[PDB]
């Protein structure tokens, strides 16, 4: 039983089934349209340049939505958007997207193929720390080894009136229930750990930082998960379990258990002839 984190194989294909089967994207887009404006309201006050740091930037969809809200709030102001991302593949697509968008003149990008850790250490070696007006870590803390040091570090880079935004699954989502109850019966991949908003808020309370946490409901249609032999439903099985071919490798005593739970009022809600795994997201805003 190997971790789906296999890398650029079943991972990607399973991920895709996750996107085209959940409101993951719409959920974040809804937050950027209704809450982001208020949040970035003063990050550029008194400045002739706005510095934005994207950790785990990814492909850039949401990144681009963020810039747009920042731009309408600060017409004419140059923006400097740096991106910290380890995967060349992700960087390639991010670049492609930029070259197709046309409202990006006052915006200059720079991409760095490295991890947030390499960034952290490599920046602790130079001179004094460069400050940022806005930093964001969207769905990537799962891949960080030392979360506390990471949160203390990046918070120390926040300039005057600056804000840091972080997004992970909610402590009240199905994932939370899925990991607590079956977390150890799933392949241990030291490349990623389980993290919910509960864990994050406790680490933030302990670090003594001031934050605000908003939850927003999202779902993942796992209807194909109850249709024996459904090849797509099997795909979702791999993403959830973080295991390749979960259906054909997992103890008959394991899956048999999951079936009953992936339907309970804690894991998923049922309606319209559908089963919707709870994908609630958390948006934490950390003040400088
Ligand atoms: C929920 C989730 N959501 C997103 N947007 N990306 C992910 N990579 C995960 C995920 C899936 C399985 C495990 Cl084991 C862990 Cl740590 C994280
Ligand atoms: C979707 N998934 C393959 C990989 C994401 C890694 C961003 S890692 C970082 N900045 N330490």
UniProtKB/Swiss-Prot annotation:
PROSITE patterns the UniProt entry points to: SAM_HNMT
Chain positions recorded as substrate binding sites: 24, 279
Gene Ontology biological-process annotations: histamine catabolic process; histamine metabolic process; L-histidine catabolic process; methylation; respiratory gaseous exchange by respiratory system
Reaction(s) catalysed (UniProt annotation): histamine + S-adenosyl-L-methionine = N(tau)-methylhistamine + S-adenosyl-L-homocysteine + H(+)
Main location: cytoplasm
Alphabetic keyword roster: Cytoplasm, Disease variant, Intellectual disability, Methyltransferase, S-adenosyl-L-methionine, Transferase
SUPFAM superfamilies: S-adenosyl-L-methionine-dependent methyltransferases
InterPro entries: HHMT-like (IPR016673), SAM-dependent_MTases_sf (IPR029063)
CDD domains for this protein: AdoMet_MTases (cd02440)
Residues at which S-adenosyl-L-methionine binds: 56, 85, 90, 116, 138
Entry's localization field: Cytoplasm
Class in the EC hierarchy, top level: transferase
Its EC number(s): 2.1.1.8
GO molecular function, one term: histamine N-methyltransferase activity
Pfam families: Methyltransf_23 (PF13489)
Protein family: Belongs to the class I-like SAM-binding methyltransferase superfamily. HNMT family.
Disease: Intellectual developmental disorder, autosomal recessive 51: A disorder characterized by significantly below average general intellectual functioning associated with impairments in adaptive behavior and manifested during the developmental period.
Function statement: Inactivates histamine by N-methylation. Plays an important role in degrading histamine and in regulating the airway response to histamine.
Name of protein: Histamine N-methyltransferase
Gene that produces this protein: HNMT
């Amino acid at each position: 039983m190997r971790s789906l984190f296999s890398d650029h194989g079943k991972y990607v294909e399973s991920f895709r089934r996750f996107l085209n089967h959940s409101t993951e994207h719409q959920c974040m887009q809804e937050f950027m349209d209704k809450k982001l404006p208020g949040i970035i309201g003063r990050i550029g006050d008194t400045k002739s340049e706005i510095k934005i740091l994207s950790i785990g930037g990814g492909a850039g969809e949401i990144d681009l939505q963020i810039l747009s809200k920042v731009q309408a709030q600060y017409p004419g102001v140059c923006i400097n958007n740096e991106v910290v991302e380890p995967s060349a593949e992700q960087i390639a697509k991010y670049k492609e997207l930029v070259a197709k968008t046309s409202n990006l003149e006052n915006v200059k990008f720079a991409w760095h193929k490295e991890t947030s850790s390499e960034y952290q250490s490599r920046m602790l070696e130079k001179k004094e720390l460069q400050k940022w007006d806005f930093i964001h870590m969207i769905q990537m803390l799962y891949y960080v080894k030392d979360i506390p040091a990471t949160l203390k570090f990046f918070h120390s880079l926040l300039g005057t009136n600056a804000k840091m935004l972080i997004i992970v699954v909610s402590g009240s989502s199905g994932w939370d229930k899925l990991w607590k109850k079956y977390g150890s019966r799933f392949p241990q991949d030291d490349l990623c750990q389980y993290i919910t908003s509960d864990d994050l808020t406790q680490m933030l309370d302990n670090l003594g930082l001031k934050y605000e946490c908003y939850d927003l409901l999202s779902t993942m249609d796992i209807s194909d998960c109850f249709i024996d032999g459904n090849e797509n439903g099997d795909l979702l099985w791999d993403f959830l379990t973080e295991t390749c071919n979960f259906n054909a490798t997992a103890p008959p005593d394991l899956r048999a258990e999951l079936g009953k739970d992936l339907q309970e009022p804690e894991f998923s809600a049922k309606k319209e002839g559908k089963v919707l795994f709870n994908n609630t997201l958390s948006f934490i805003v950390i003040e400088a």
